Structure formats: C-alpha cells, structure tokens
Amino acid sequence: PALRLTLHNLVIQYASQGRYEVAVPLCKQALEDLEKTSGHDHPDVATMLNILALVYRDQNKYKDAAHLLNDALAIREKTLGKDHPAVAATLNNLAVLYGKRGKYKEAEPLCKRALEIREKVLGKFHPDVAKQLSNLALLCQNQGKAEEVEYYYRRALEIYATRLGPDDPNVAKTKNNLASCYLKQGKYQDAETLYKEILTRAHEKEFGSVNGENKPIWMHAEEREESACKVDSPTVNTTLRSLGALYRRQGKLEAAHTLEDCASRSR
Amino acid sequence: PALRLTLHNLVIQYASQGRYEVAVPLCKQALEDLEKTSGHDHPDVATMLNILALVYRDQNKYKDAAHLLNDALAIREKTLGKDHPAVAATLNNLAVLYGKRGKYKEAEPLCKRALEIREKVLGKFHPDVAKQLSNLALLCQNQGKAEEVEYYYRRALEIYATRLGPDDPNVAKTKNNLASCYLKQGKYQDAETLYKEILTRAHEKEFGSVNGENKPIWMHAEEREESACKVDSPTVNTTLRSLGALYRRQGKLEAAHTLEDCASRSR
Numbered sequence: 001p002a003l004r005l006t007l008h009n010l011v012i013q014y015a016s017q018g019r020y021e022v023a024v025p026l027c028k029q030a031l032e033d034l035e036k037t038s039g040h041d042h043p044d045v046a047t048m049l050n051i052l053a054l055v056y057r058d059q060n061k062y063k064d065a066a067h068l069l070n071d072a073l074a075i076r077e078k079t080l081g082k083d084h085p086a087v088a089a090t091l092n093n094l095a096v097l098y099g100k101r102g103k104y105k106e107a108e109p110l111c112k113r114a115l116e117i118r119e120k121v122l123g124k125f126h127p128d129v130a131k132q133l134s135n136l137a138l139l140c141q142n143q144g145k146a147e148e149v150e151y152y153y154r155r156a157l158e159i160y161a162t163r164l165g166p167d168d169p170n171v172a173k174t175k176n177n178l179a180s181c182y183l184k185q186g187k188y189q190d191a192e193t194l195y196k197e198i199l200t201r202a203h204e205k206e207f208g209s210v211n212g213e214n215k216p217i218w219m220h221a222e223e224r225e226e227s228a229c230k231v232d233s234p235t236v237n238t239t240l241r242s243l244g245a246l247y248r249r250q251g252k253l254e255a256a257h258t259l260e261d262c263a264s265r266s267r
Numbered sequence: 268p269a270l271r272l273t274l275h276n277l278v279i280q281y282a283s284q285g286r287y288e289v290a291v292p293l294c295k296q297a298l299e300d301l302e303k304t305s306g307h308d309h310p311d312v313a314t315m316l317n318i319l320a321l322v323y324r325d326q327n328k329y330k331d332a333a334h335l336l337n338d339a340l341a342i343r344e345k346t347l348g349k350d351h352p353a354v355a356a357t358l359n360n361l362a363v364l365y366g367k368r369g370k371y372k373e374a375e376p377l378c379k380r381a382l383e384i385r386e387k388v389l390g391k392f393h394p395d396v397a398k399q400l401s402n403l404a405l406l407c408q409n410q411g412k413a414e415e416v417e418y419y420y421r422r423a424l425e426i427y428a429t430r431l432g433p434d435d436p437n438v439a440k441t442k443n444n445l446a447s448c449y450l451k452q453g454k455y456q457d458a459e460t461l462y463k464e465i466l467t468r469a470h471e472k473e474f475g476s477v478n479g480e481n482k483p484i485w486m487h488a489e490e491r492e493e494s495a496c497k498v499d500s501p502t503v504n505t506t507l508r509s510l511g512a513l514y515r516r517q518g519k520l521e522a523a524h525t526l527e528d529c530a531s532r533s534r
Binding site for chain 2: 123124125127154158161162163165189193196200210212215216219222223226
C-alpha cells in the first residue's frame with residue numbers, strides 16, 4: 001500500500017493499544033474504503049476487517065464482529081488459499097467469538113481446521129499446537145463428545161508431558177481433564193490411575209527420593225482403610241476431591257473421608 | 268528340638284544344597300518319624316514335610332509333592348493359625364506345584380489367599396506384594412482371564428512405579444506385560460500409550476532436560492511419516508519392536524522402520 005494507506009494503518013494499531021476505541025474504529029473504516037476503491041477484494045482488506053472484528057468484540061458487538069471475520073476468512077481463502085498461516089489465526093479468532101456466545105457446535109469445525117493447518121506449518125509435535133488441542137478438546141468438554149476428547153487429550157498430554165517438564169501445570173490440568181472424560185465413559189480404573197499420577201508426581205516435587213517410609217497421600221489413604229500434607233496448589237486440591245469420589249464409589253469411605261482432610265485444610 | 272533332631276536336620280539342608288537327593292530324603296523321613304513319636308502333630312513336622320515336598324518336586328514326583336504340602340498346610344493352619352507368614356509361603360509353594368502341572372484353576376485361590384496374608388503382614392504397598400501380584404497376573408494370563416490380569420498388573424505397576432525409581436526394570440517389564448494384555452483385548456491405543464511411556468522415560472535417562480529439539484525416538488518416527496538412538500537395553504529393544512508392529516498395523520510403515528532399524532542396530 002501507499003505510505004498514506006500504511007501510516008494511516010500504523011496509527012489504527014497505535015491508538016487501539018491504549019484501548020482508545022471509538023477513536024480507532026472510524027479510521028479503520030476510512031482505510032478499508034480507500035483499499036476497496038484502490039484494489040479489491042485483496043488480502044489487506046481482510047487484515048483490516050480482522051482488526052475491526054477484534055475492536056467490535058471488545059465493544060461486545062458480537063453479531064457484527066463475527067460477520068466481519070467470516071468475510072475476512074472468505075477473502076483469505078480465495079487469495080492466500082487453504083492451509084495458509086494467516087487463515088489459521090482467523091479461524092481461531094472466529095472460533096473464540098463463537099465460544100464466547102456458547103456456540104460450541106459451529107466452533108468445533110473451525111477449531112479442528114485451524115489445528116490441521118498448525119500441524120502442517122509447525123509439525124505434529126510443536127507446543128503452540130498442544131495449545132490447540134487442550135483448547136479444541138475443551139470445545140468438546142463442553143459438547144460432551146468424550147471419545148474424541150479422549151483422543152485429543154491423549155494427543156495433548158503426549159506433547160505437554162514430553163516437550164515440557166513433569167512439573168508443568170498443563171500436564172496436571174490435561175490429566176484432570178482426561179480423568180473426567182474417563183469417568184464419564186465409566187472407565188473408573190483409567191481415571192483412578194491418572195489421579196494417582198498427579199499426586200505421586202506432586203509428592204516428588206518437594207519430598208525428594210520418594211523413600212520407603214515416604215509414600216504419597218493416596219497410599220496412606222488406602223492403608224488407612226485398614227480399620228502432614230498442607231499443599232495450597234489449586235489443581236492438586238481438585239485432584240484430592242475428584243478421587244475422594246472414587247474411593248466413595250468403591251466403598252472405601254474412611255479413605256475418601258480422609259481425601260477432604262487436605263483439600264479443605266490447604267484452602 | 269534335641270541337638271540330635273537339630274544336627275540331623277542341619278545336614279538335610281546341607282547335603283540337598285549340592286542337589287544330593289536320594290541321600291537327603293531318607294534322612295528327612297527318619298527325622299519326621301522321630302518328631303512324630305516325640306511330639307505330634309507340631310509345626311516342625313510341617314517344616315520337614317515342606318522340605319520333603321520340595322525334594323519330591325525336584326524328582327518330578329508331583330502327586331507325592333502336592334500331597335505333603337497339603338498336610339504341612341493343615342498342620343500350620345492348626346498350630347500357627349491362618350494369616351501366619353509361614354502359611355503364606357506354603358500356599359505359594361503349593362500354587363507353584365499346581366501351576367507346573369497346568370492346574371491353574373485350583374492354583375489361583377491358593378495364590379489369592381497368600382496375597383491377602385502378605386498384605387496383612389507387610390501392608391498393601393510393600394514391594395513383596397507386587398511380587399505376588401505379578402505371579403497372580405501370570406496365572407490369570409494362563410487361564411485367559413484378561414480383565415483380572417489387567418487388574419493385577421495395574422496393582423503391581425502401581426507399587427513398582429511409586430516405591431521404586433522410574434528407571435527400575437520391573438516398571439518396564441510390568442508395562443510390557445500389561446501392554447500385551449491390552450493387545451489381546453484389542454485395546455491398541457492403551458498398549459501404544461504404555462509403549463510410548465517406556466521409550467519416553469528411557470529417552471530421559473541419558474538425554475537430560477527433554478528439550479524442544481530433543482524429542483523421543485517415536486516422535487521422530489511419526490514426524491518422519493510426513494513424506495542417533497543406540498540403546499543396548501533388552502527390554503527397550505522389545506518395546507521398540509512392539510510399538511513398531513502397531514505402526515505397521517496403522518499403515519505408518521516409515522515410522523515402523525525407524526524404531527525397527529534402531530532395535531536391530533542396538534543388538
């Protein structure tokens with residue numbers, strides 16, 4: 001573009017940074033008009049629609065915001081084509097707007113496609129891609145899609161656990177999420193295993209060499225069923241409670257009762 | 268006993284150590300006769316019947332061997348009572364003899380009871396329990412009771428992985444055993460996950476912090492499917508060949524070659 005349509009454009013981003021909407025929305029339009037007269041339907045017209053869609057979302061004009069991104073998407077699909085990185089960002093932004101209104105059904109395909117493009121660009125095992133998974137799986141954690149969200153969380157965990165440390169929060173969060181999906185699928189043992197993994201891993205993040213007399217809380221819980229744990233971690237607390245429902249289901253009531261003992265003290 | 272019936276006894280064990288049977292069994296009888304005249308039915312007679320039963324098993328006189336252990340068991344149950352550690356060993360030895368003749372059905376309850384006693388004595392999570400759970404998983408495996416095998420290997424792995432280091436061979440061995448169980452049931456995903464866990468863990472036992480650009484072999488294998496591992500560990504080699512077979516089933520033949528060529532180089 002001419003350094004009119006570029007400096008014009010440079011301030012759009014500039015004044016909106018200090019959240020100065022109203023100011024910016026008007027300029028962006030004046031730009032798009034100049035662009036659609038001096039070169040249409042072109043990919044730049046789409047980049048501007050994108051910024052305008054973002055500003056509308058921030059003003060809670062969701063109907064208007066969504067409409068623009070769809071038109072920016074169609075422009076980018078014609079020009080830059082399918083599998084293009086800029087098409088991936090647009091699909092995500094539209095999936096976001098759809099999720100904000102609780103339209104999960106129509107958000108899933110958009111998010112599924114964005115992930116496919118992201119795998120082509122970055123590779124199947126990049127962690128920018130692991131985002132897309134424990135985000136796309138959490139699309140279907142709303143839709144109760146379970147067999148798919150078993151697949152996507154396993155794929156997600158596969159990347160998180162390997163590419164990042166065992167003390168990374170995404171690992172425990174994905175494990176809890178896969179744990180709930182196993183519970184829903186009546187695979188109680190498979191859920192129990194995952195919960196034990198979180199607690200065992202977390203026990204080792206402070207209590208060194210995991211000694212003979214140094215056992216994780218769940219072991220003491222089960223051994224107590226033959227009749228020192230204050231941890232202010234929010235994810236651990238949830239794990240503590242969630243399994244305290246498995247121990248109740250199995251009739252291991254004293255263990256399950258002992259699973260609130262460190263969930264309500266450490267909070 | 269009198270230092271006649273003790274030194275008499277001391278040589279039983281002594282001459283049988285160098286596998287000198289024929290010699291020993293005659294003495295063991297002479298001892299049991301002296302014991303049954305000078306104090307019957309008593310726990311020591313049972314210990315001698317035990318040694319006798321062991322010697323008979325080694326001479327392949329299985330009918331005779333099993334009959335004696337049953338009588339030693341009944342003596343120990345009367346004297347030392349149920350839940351006594353010495354009863355546990357007897358039940359295991361009788362379960363062994365029954366397994367050697369392919370009588371798995373009648374061996375399972377004996378082995379199940381021995382485990383219950385071992386849990387009372389040592390606690391639900393002592394390593395010696397994981398030895399029973401592995402023997403118990405293997406008997407069920409011979410009966411084709413896969414759902415129970417799955418249960419017993421999960422229980423054993425639970426102990427091994429937690430109580431012992433992640434580099435402990437029992438972990439990988441139990442994981443391979445559970446994987447085969449999963450394969451037999453047609454639960455290919457659950458087996459694939461286990462195989463990947465072994466390789467990922469083993470990758471971290473030399474290649475430090477598991478960096479972004481430092482991925483495990485199976486990742487490189489799958490990423491290669493978009494078209495440096497010499498490890499002389501025998502268990503790992505098996506895992507590589509097994510996961511390789513799953514990729515072959517999925518039609519990911521290039522991924523399969525990657526792991527297979529790694530195995531055949533490290534042997």
